[PDB]
Amino acid sequence: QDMRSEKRGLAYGYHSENDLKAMQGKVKWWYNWDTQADANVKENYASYGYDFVPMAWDENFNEEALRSFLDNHPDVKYLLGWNEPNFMEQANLTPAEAAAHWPVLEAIAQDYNLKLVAPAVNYSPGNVDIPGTDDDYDPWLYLDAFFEACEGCQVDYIAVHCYMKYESAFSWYVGEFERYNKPIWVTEWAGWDDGGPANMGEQMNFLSDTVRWMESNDNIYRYSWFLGRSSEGYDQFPYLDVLLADGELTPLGSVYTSIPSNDFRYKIPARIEAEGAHSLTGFKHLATTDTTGLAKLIAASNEVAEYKLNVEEGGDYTLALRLASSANSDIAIRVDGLLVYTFEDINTGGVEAWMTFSSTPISLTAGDHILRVESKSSRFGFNWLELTN
Ligand SMILES: [Mg+2]
């Protein structure tokens, strides 16, 4: 398949080569808050299609290690600036200070032909004084003061952190940063504040809502989920982990890496994870215990899933669905809006009893097509689909 997302990255510092291969061609870049790539992948990450974005975490970073790493990786194209300088417990730099030290990063960007990402901000506890305001917590008041102190400074991108749990809050809050007229990097996000996700499925729904919004926002240059693996583990609140055992994904990690960009098109024959729909009405996410697929979509009613196909060899394909359904369930299949097959009285006897149901052949001409999977007032689980010729 083509590269699944050009924007999608990951925040994690302990990749193995097997971890990078598990996500290959579904994750484009990553960063680790440090000046060089993870030790076990430093030599080979570029061969799996990734680019690594180094970071100057605060003003006292190790410039020698960063310049030395850059010397041997001319594939590096971007440099992240200070990390949460408006937080006391992080980089702890008032706007003037962060601009004062910015030439160190420009000199680096000049020597290696790099682009510079602004210091990452978020609503802060307010303990780094911004001049001329009492609202020291304010990420926009911080960046304004930064930019006014940084006259003539090379700043190519904005970096944003966000831990809101509501996808509409998230899109409103990240959109506020489009005011600066620069592409945006959401370099840390997950649903976490105000109680966060009630369960793993809530986090997967929130990841899906916000990933889909960012893939459709042209002003978002890049995003990276927080984070590859957590100290607490993937089934502990707030269910952050994208990677499970070496070289394998969590259910959430399957949703994260499967969601396609606007222009990506699936080639066939292929198996396509259900969580890789270009478009979801109503469908929700859960872990599955099926032997493959990691995550399922769940239907209670009339939910719709659409899959955008680049059919290179027109002809008749059989469509297979991997389903679970306690009772009788009906599923309509459409191509560019017109019914072609209906799965009737699907019944596996349990919500985690899985079977593969095949259709009669469906004619799929060469070109661009929307494959639509509609629940027909049915209650079932949907792991992946397969088209074969
Ligand atoms: Mg799946």
Residue numbers in the entry: 85 to 473
Quote what the paper states about this structure.
CBM6E exhibits catalytic activity at intermediate temperatures and efficiently produces GOS with DPs of 3–6 from curdlan. The CBM6 module of CBM6E (CBM6E-CBM6) exhibits a strong binding affinity specifically to curdlan, effectively enhancing the enzyme’s activity against curdlan.
The structure of CBM6E comprises two distinct domains: an (α/β)-barrel catalytic domain (residues 84–348) belonging to the GH128 family, and a C-terminal β-sandwich domain (residues 349–473) belonging to the CBM6 family. The CBM6 domain forms an interdomain interface with GH128 primarily through hydrogen bonds between α8 and α9 of the GH128 domain and β10 and β13 of the CBM6 domain. This ion demonstrated an six-coordinate octahedral geometry and coordinated with Glu357 OE1, Glu359 OE1, Ala379 O, Asn467 OD, Asn467 O, and a water molecule. To identify ancillary binding sites for curdlan triple helices, we conducted molecular docking experiments using a triple-helical β-1,3-glucan undecamer and the apo structure of CBM6E. In Model 1, the triple-helical β-1,3-glucan displayed a favorable structural complementarity with the CBM6 domain, while its nonreducing ends made contact with the GH128 domain. Model 2 revealed the triple-helical β-1,3-glucan spanning across the active groove of the GH128 domain. Overall, both docking models, in conjunction with the crystal structure of CBM6E in complex with GOS, support the hypothesis that triple-helical curdlan unwinding precedes its hydrolysis within the catalytic groove.
